[PDB]
DNA sequence: TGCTCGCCAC
DNA sequence: CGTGGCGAGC
DNA sequence: GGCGAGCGCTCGCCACG
């Protein structure tokens, strides 16, 4: 009677409409459109939302079926059309739009009808042949005959759609760079909402934000399908639209935001776009151009500081191998090493490349450029080998089976989620504490907005310092009981850090915290609090333990062609320093 | 002083009364009613007809205004009541009947009176609330209070009304299903022919009555559908469906099967078949494609009624399976049986074939290849399309061709050619000696017009006239047209639009441009297959009156697409050497 | 084919 | 001020 | 041709920056 998708859509509208500063990002005609939506019948509201969730494009009216709403949708379509929310095929005026709507057999059929050569050609080829054929006019005729085949067709009008689209964005900004159906059914974590800052300066700021989003979505799509040439041109235009925008007043206010909010601005999105542009240029072998763009990204310090390590490291790689330019390479590593935002994984990666360069014929002469190098070296781990199966049932599953043979009856393979879940269970009320401005912006967040930022720790330092000492010296019964508290009071609530299914039971989690002990846990929680983005990624694939003796090993698992990455090497050593027993398990090919 | 509606009503009575066998389809009291009507006063006759043309429903006497009948209608009402033609509110005893008679203020007023919750509700909601409330009776009280509001009121008595109703039907059978007696009657001059009865259409008085009630039901259902009342339309059809199978092998049907096709359309079974055919459209509007298909298979499983419709049926059946149902092999079977069926005329045939080609040529259907082997190679040629950028979509096209040098032009659709056909072949279309096509003096067309036997019954005269037209020089064409025009202008023929041409001269100029071969071709198609020919003809005919260049144009705006029939006829005209075009108007 | 719009005697 | 929710007429 | 109704959308009022 009152279905989930509508309920969830109604919640979102209510929230955004409630907030006056958000409403300042719409002009009067746009506000009027939301009003008009509210004026629609309930059957009208249902159809619009079912169409708004669909791909923005025409759909066949005989494929519309929502029996619970109306047996025959025609008069509802009519209402939505009269109100300016939907169009019918009367407004189908682009040949490409209609050619996009037709299936393959149909397109083929139409092709034979017009005596189109090579009709067996793939859809893009057919569409292009028709369109070219129209450039002999004839286009109008191909159009009408296609529409006859399509039958009655409807599309959401793009004006109103983009309004709701930007409202969506405003409601959940952290999903933009990451609609979700389950919303009616998911239980969210507890916290008190506390909003303090305007994120978007104005209507136009939102619109530029939205267009950046769609571009990023376009480019991503192209890359996924191996269309790197198309991906490049779209990126180059996007690149042009960004420089053509840098000048705008709203950016000045974005630059004033702390990092964990700054990620929800137009500029941050284009920076992400530029970062993918780097990968695209390389796939296309344009290593020269990739390098200037990298130097450009690295020359500014407002956006994506978290990414700098990835950038420096790729820049060096392109110089060292792609460009073979040895002295700027050394320069790069030294600046990179000097960059305080680079976390230890990429740092180790950069250094490792310096050593490599300082020790081959190529670089004997530049000896005086290598003096600044710190002697940051990383400890040795214990290494075993096992045989594989296949060409593979999951490497990790094979490892797990072997350690169960070696007397480790318990074992988990959540990667970073293992520890991050324990972190979550031990520090829940601090992660979600009140008094920290702007970290909670709606009641449907899975995490504080500053979580993956340096200011997470600095903003909760007193509480964090007191909790980490309390864990470090906590008795085993304390550890188990703290975990149980959070587990019992929060189980099911959706927290991005926590995997409610990672452990088979509270008891398993209690047994694990007992084996790890307070000192280790404290060490791990400190690193995650202090530097979450970097820390989360280098954690061992596996934890296995003997439930009687509480002997445990934290295992990184490596098949053929699999080798420790820099981050993983930095973390295995750190764990080893906390006295935890660590191992690298290699599966060998069968 | 003697108005059209009465004149026309008098003609209808005259015609039916004239035929003694038709009069046998009423009993004595019913005949007596018609006598009493003729007994009724001239002011009386006027009021009765004005009320007979209204819905069968109560009317307030204080809402009656007909100064042309009487300044005070009270005694006229009284005459009609005493004679048993109207009933007054003394016989108003049904709650629903009275609740249907009240307007909005009144229903609201009554609502306050009985302490109804929401007297501000809409009328139908109030009517329904009162009627439910009456299901507790208290009906009598709601009735009297409603009548107090209505005032003095009358309704046409249903017995006598149904007699006149069947008389009307007998006069003009092709008005009965028309929805899916006419006014001029005193003033229209009808074509010449000889009156010719040879078959009884109705086996008995009862068969006629069942026929008439089927007609009214079909008319009811059709009305509902037209208003988008598809749910009510469905129920009505379901009942009608029940009444037909409830009757099926009844004695009267045997005699209906004996009738030639052009009378068979005036029998109960044919009407229910039409009803079931609307049933198909209803089920599809309701998306009930499963149920639609059994009904189609059922209508196609009998071959006594509506062979004209078989093409529509086959084609819809194929589409429903091919789309939505997606059941590929029976679809192919269906199309092939359809294509095999000699009743299917060329428009739907083309439509069926088109669908076969589509199915025969996609990966989904490679395997069924052995089911396509019988396929005849009936193909229809591709025509040329031009485009230009409301006002008059037809009017815009007309203006454009005037700019392109075609100073004359007619937005005539099929009536343009059908009118020319009429003017060139009138005396043969209406020639004497052909049994059963002319049954009374008030027909607008021969009864066999829409039937196979139209052509076969006039074949020798047609063959000789079509050859004569094929070789006719301009001057012959102009002269023949003028002859018929001058001797028949004004006569009501359904084929002929006396206003389609601006003048005789325009029609003569057009026949001069078309020439004999084209005209011959057109007349042959219309004679051979009139129903199908009439519908597919181009929206426009435009011509240059000096050079006699003409173009036949079909016009398509946004959301406007060539139908199968139109594609078949553009090709045919092109084959006769006429220049044809499809003109698309694109949005500005 | 736009279109806001639904019938009832003339 | 400027804005837009927002409740009575054609 | 007559309208009997339905009925969804402007114009002012207030609040809220």
Comparing CB atoms, the residue among A72, A91, A138 nearest residue B287 is: A72
CA–CA separation, A556 and A553 (whole Å): 10
Strands (E), B141-283: 153-156
Work out the minimum CA distance from A61 to partner chain B, whole angstroms.
Answer: 12
Chain B nearest CA to A177, separation (Å): 39
Summary count for chain A: helices (H), strands (E): 27, 8
Domain residue spans of chain A:
1-92+152-200, 93-151, 201-378, 379-590
* Contacting residues 24-63/A vs strand D (CB within 7 A): 26-28, 31-32, 34-35
CB contact at 8 A, A441 and A195: yes
Any idea which residue has 């066999």 for tokens?
B448
DSSP alpha helix (H) spans, A432-499: 455-458, 461-472, 476-490
Q: What's phi and psi for A588, nearest 5 deg?
A: -100, 145
Measure Cα distances from A373 to A345, A352, A378, B467 in Å: 17, 11, 15, 108
Residues of A in contact with B230 (CB under 8 A): 72
Q: Is B230 on the interface with A (CB under 8 A)?
A: yes
Distance B52 CA to C9 C1' (A): 10
A103 touches B: beta carbon within 8 Å: no
Tokens representing B530 are 């009139």
Q: How far is the CA of B104 from the C1' of E11 (A)?
A: 28
Residues in contact with B563: Cβ distance below 8 Å, sequence separation at least 6, in sequence order: B347, B536
Work out the burial of residue A122: count CB atoms within 10 Å of its CB; fewer than 13 is exposed, 13-18 middle, 19 or more buried: exposed
What values do phi and psi take at B2, rounded to 5?
Answer: -120, 85
Candidates A112, A100, A113, A5; CA nearest to A60 is A100
Of the candidates A67, A105, A140, the beta carbon closest to that of B362 is on: A105
Contacts A72 to B, Cβ<8 Å: 230, 285-287
Taking the C-alpha atoms of residue A260 and residue A239, their distance in angstroms, rounded to an integer, is: 24
Q: DSSP code of A578? A: T
Asked if A148 reaches chain B (Cβ–Cβ under 8 Å), the answer is yes
Q: Are A116 and A132 in contact (CB under 8 A)?
A: no
B357: nearest CA in chain A? A109
In terms of Cα–Cα distance, which of A213, A313, A231 is closest to A280? Answer: A231
Decide: B16 and B171 in contact? Cβ < 8 Å.
yes
Q: Is B183 on the interface with A (CB under 8 A)?
A: no
> For residue B584, what is the nearest residue in chain A, using CA coordinates?
A140
Resolution (A): 3.8
A442: left (phi over 0), alpha (psi -120 to 50) or beta: beta
Q: B545 is written with which tokens?
A: 């009156």
Handedness of CA A532, A538, A542, A545 (dihedral sign): negative
Distance A40 CA to D8 C1' (A): 19
Question: A343: helix, coil or strand?
Answer: coil
For strand D, is any atom closer than 7 Å to the CB of A21?
A: no
Does the beta-carbon distance from B361 to A65 stay under 8 Å? Answer: no
> B543 vs A26, A158, B162, B402, B414, CA distance in Å?
57, 45, 52, 9, 17
End-to-end CA distance of chain A: 58
Count interface pairs A-B at CB distance under 8 A: 56
B57 CB contacts (<8 Å, ≥6 apart)? B97, B100, B101, B155
In the three-class reduction of DSSP (H, G, I as helix; E, B as strand; rest coil), residue B474 is classed as: helix
Considering CB atoms only, which of A72, A108, A144 is closest to B286? A72
Structural contact between residues B122 and B130, judged by C-beta atoms closer than 8 angstroms: no
A140 and B363 in contact by Cβ < 8 A? no
Residue B311 to chain A, least CA–CA distance (Å): 20
Tokens coding A561: 């062609």
A72, A109, A138 member nearest B285 (Cβ): A72
CA B132 to chain centroid, in Å, comes to 38
Q: Chain B contact for A90, CB < 8 A? A: yes
Of B230, B363, B584, the CB nearest to A141: B584
The C-alpha of B572 sits at a distance from chain A's nearest C-alpha, in angstroms, of 18
Q: Is A72 on the interface with B (CB under 8 A)?
A: yes
Query: Of A140, A152, A153, which to mutate for an interface test with B (greatest number of B Cβ within 10 Å)?
Result: A140
The candidate with the shortest Cα–Cα distance to A51, out of A61, A41, A40, is A61
B385 — contact with chain A (CB < 8 Å)?
A: yes
A475 touches chain B (CB under 8 A): no
Q: What span, in angstroms and rounded, lies between the C-alpha atoms of B43 and B2?
A: 10
Listing from the earlier edge strand, what are the strands of the sheet with B59-60? B59-60, B153-156, B86-88
Proportion of chain A in helix, strand, coil states, percent, rounded to 5: 60, 5, 35
Is residue B584 less than 8 Å (CB to CB) from chain A?
yes
Q: Which of A538, A453, A552, A443 is nearest to A494 (CA)?
A: A443
Q: To which H or E segment does residue A543 belong?
A: strand A542-545
Q: Is residue A45 within 8 Å of residue A6, measured between CB atoms? A: yes
CB-based contact B285 A140, cutoff 8 Å = no
Cα-flanking dihedrals φ and ψ of residue B179, to 5°?
A: -35, -45
**Interatomic CA distance for residues B484 and B425, integer angstroms:** 9
Task: Note which residues in 285-344 of chain B have CB less than 8 A from chain A.
Answer: 285-287, 323-324
> Within 10 Å of residue A513's Cβ, how many Cβ atoms?
25
Q: How far is the CA of A261 from the C1' of E15 (A)?
A: 31
Closest nucleotide (C1' vs CA) to A30 is D4
**Which backbone phi and psi does B392 adopt, to 5 degrees?**
-115, 115
Which residues on adjacent β-strands are paired with residue B583? B386, B555
Reading the block at residue A41, the tokens are: 């019948």
Cα distance between residue B192 and residue A568, in whole Å: 105
- Cβ contacts of A406 within 8 Å, gap of 6 or more: none
Confirm if B570 and B554 have CB atoms less than 8 A apart: yes
Q: Could A141 and B364 be called an inter-chain contact, meaning their C-beta atoms sit closer than 8 Å?
A: no
Give the rounded distance of the alpha carbon of A482 from its chain centre: 31
Give the chain B residue whose CA is nearest to the CA of A144.
Answer: B561
A145 touches chain B (CB under 8 A): yes
Among partner residues B285, B363, B586, which is closest to A140 by beta-carbon distance? B586
Token digits of residue B42: 């001239």
**Exposed (0-12), middle (13-18) or buried (19+): which is B313, by Cβ within 10 Å?**
buried
Nucleotides of D under 7 A from a protein CB: 3-6
- C-beta neighbour count of A19 within 10 angstroms: 11
A20 touches strand D (CB under 7 A): no
| Method of elucidation | X-ray
Closest nucleotide (C1' vs CA) to B107 is E5
CA distance A496 to A489: 17
- Please, are residues B61 and B51 in contact by the beta-carbon 8 Å criterion? no
Closest CA–CA distance from residue B458 to any residue of chain A (Å): 39
Nucleotides on strand E with an atom closer than 7 A to protein CB? 4-9, 16-17
| Chain A residues within an 8 Å CB radius of B358 | 105, 109
**Cβ of A112 under 8 Å from any chain B Cβ?**
yes
Facing A71 at nearest CB: one of B287, B362, B387: B287
- Tell me which residue of A190, A116, A168 sits closest to A11, measured CA to CA: A168
Q: CB-based burial of residue A161 (10 Å sphere; 0-12 exposed, 13-18 middle, 19+ buried)?
A: middle
Render B11-54 in DSSP notation, one character per residue.
HHHHHHHH-HHHHTTS-HHHHHHHHHHHHS-HHHHHHHHHHHTS
- Dihedral sign for Cα B171, B177, B181, B185, please: negative
- Asked whether the beta carbons of residue B559 and residue A65 sit closer than 8 angstroms, the reply is no
CB-CB neighbors (< 8 A) of B363 in chain A: 105
Residue of A nearest to B583 (CA): A141
- Report how far Cα B34 is from the mean position of its chain's Cα atoms: 28
* Residue B217 C-alpha, separation from nearest chain A C-alpha, in angstroms: 24
């Amino acid at each position: 009677e009152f279905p989930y998708y509508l309920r969830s859509f109604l919640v979102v509208l209510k929230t955004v409409l409630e907030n006056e500063d958000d409403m300042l990002l719409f002009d009067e005609q746009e506000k009027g459109i939301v009003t008009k939506f509210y004026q629609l019948s309930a059957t009208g509201q249902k159809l619009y939302v079912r169409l708004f969730q669909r791909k923005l494009s025409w759909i066949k009216m005989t494929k519309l079926e929502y029996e619970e709403i109306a047996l025959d949708l025609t008069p509802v379509i009519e209402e939505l059309t009269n109100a300016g929310f939907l169009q019918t095929e009367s407004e189908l005026q682009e040949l490409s739009e209609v050619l996009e709507l037709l299936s393959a057999p149909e397109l083929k059929s139409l092709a034979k009808t017009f005596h189109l050569v090579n009709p067996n050609g793939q859809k893009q080829q057919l569409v292009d042949a028709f369109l070219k054929l129209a450039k002999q006019g004839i286009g109008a005729v191909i159009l009408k005959r296609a529409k006859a085949l399509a039958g009655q067709s409807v599309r959401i009008c793009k004006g109103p759609r983009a309004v709701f689209s930007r409202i969506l964005l405003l409601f959940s900004l952290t999903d933009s760079m990451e609609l979700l159906v389950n919303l009616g059914r998911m239980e969210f974590p507890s916290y008190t909402i506390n909003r303090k800052t305007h994120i978007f300066q104005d209507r136009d700021d939102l619109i530029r934000y939205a267009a950046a989003t769609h571009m990023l979505s376009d480019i991503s799509s192209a890359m996924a399908n191996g269309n790197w040439e198309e991906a490049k041109e779209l990126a180059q235009c996007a690149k042009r639209d960004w420089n053509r925008l840098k000048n705008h007043p709203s950016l000045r206010c974005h630059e004033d935001l702390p990092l964990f909010l700054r990620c929800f601005t137009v500029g941050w999105i284009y920076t992400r776009i530029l970062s993918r542009f780097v990968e695209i240029l390389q796939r296309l072998h344009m290593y020269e151009e990739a390098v200037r763009e990298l130097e450009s990204l690295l020359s500014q310090r407002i956006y994506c500081p978290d990414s700098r390590g990835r950038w420096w490291d790729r820049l060096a790689l392109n110089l060292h191998q792609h460009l073979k330019r040895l002295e700027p390479t050394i320069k790069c590593i030294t600046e990179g090493l000097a960059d305080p935002e680079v976390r230890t994984g990429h740092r180790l990666s950069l250094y490792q490349r310096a050593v490599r360069l300082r020790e081959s014929p190529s670089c004997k002469k530049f000896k005086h450029l290598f003096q600044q190098l710190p002697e940051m070296a990383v400890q040795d781990v214990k290494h075993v080998t096992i045989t594989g199966r296949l060409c593979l049932c999951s490497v990790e599953e094979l490892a797990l089976a072997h350690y169960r043979r070696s007397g480790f009856d318990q074992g988990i393979h959540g990667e970073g989620s293992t520890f991050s879940t324990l972190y979550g269970l031990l520090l829940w009320d601090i992660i979600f504490m009140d008094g920290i401005p702007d970290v909670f912006r709606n009641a449907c967040q899975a995490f504080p907005l500053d979580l993956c930022t340096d200011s997470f720790f600095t903003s909760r330092r007193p509480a964090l310092e007191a909790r980490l000492q309390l864990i470090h010296d906590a008795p085993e019964e304390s550890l188990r009981a703290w975990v149980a508290a959070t587990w019992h009071e929060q189980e099911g609530r959706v927290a991005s850090l926590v995997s409610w299914d990672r452990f088979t039971s509270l008891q398993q989690a209690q047994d694990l915290v007992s084996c790890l002990g307070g000192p280790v846990l404290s060490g791990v929680c400190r690193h995650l609090a202090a530097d979450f983005r970097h820390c989360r990624g280098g954690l061992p694939a596996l934890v296995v333990w003997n439930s009687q003796s509480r002997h445990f090993k934290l295992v990184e698992v490596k098949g053929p062609n699999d080798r420790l990455s820099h981050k993983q090497m930095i973390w295995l050593a750190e764990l080893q320093k906390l006295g935890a027993e660590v191992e690298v398990c290699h599966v060998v090919a069968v």
